[PDB]
């Protein structure tokens, strides 16, 4: 009888055996592929995760933020009828991905990551959004990424002539803009179904393409340099 809605309007996140939850989610991602979809219950869990992400004292502010994102995305579905089958909370997840909230979810399905309930809830709605966006949101072209990862991080995940099944939310840009920092690792990735999320982003001047965990890349070449980029990865998305 605890936490009735008039006293506690957010559903509590499932905190039991997070390692098992992460294993079950990764199995589902691989099995469901492009048919992965968040359930109504998972969308409500994602609502709790987002509103509570900063702790109790920020829930009133983050509730207002949540309401504003929901309104923006409901309006977006109306103004862009190709999106009318999207779940509003899945679109909100794409907007949330483009905020600083991304750190809770980017790596949550990595084998060695410590999972959190918040990250797992975010992940389900982002993955659902990416696989439910219509095909006109897919980008066909080379997309660009830079990250400050260590050499062993790269070699644990990418090998020339091998297929990487990426467990990360892997972000890239359609454009290779000048940047203030030369990154330790760069990628050139050929996208076939990577999804353009600029329409949903909080940084509308960006042209971000986002791949979900489970994306497969044929790694064709890894270049080494003595200075940045220490590693440059050339890879191509495959079915």
Author numbering: 58 to 296
Q: Would you copy out the relevant sentences from the publication that reported this structure?
A:
XopAI, encoded by XAC3230 in Xac, is a putative type III effector composed of 296 amino acids. XopAI resembles a bent right hand, and it can be dissected as a two-lobe structure with an N-terminal α-helical lobe (residues 74 to 193), and a C-terminal β-sandwich lobe (residues 194 to 296). XopAI possesses a highly negatively charged surface at its central cleft, whereas a positively charged surface is required for interacting electrostatically with the negatively charged phosphate group of NAD+ in mARTs. From analyses of the crystal packing, we found that XopAI uses an altered mART domain to bind its own N-terminal peptide containing a conserved Arg residue.
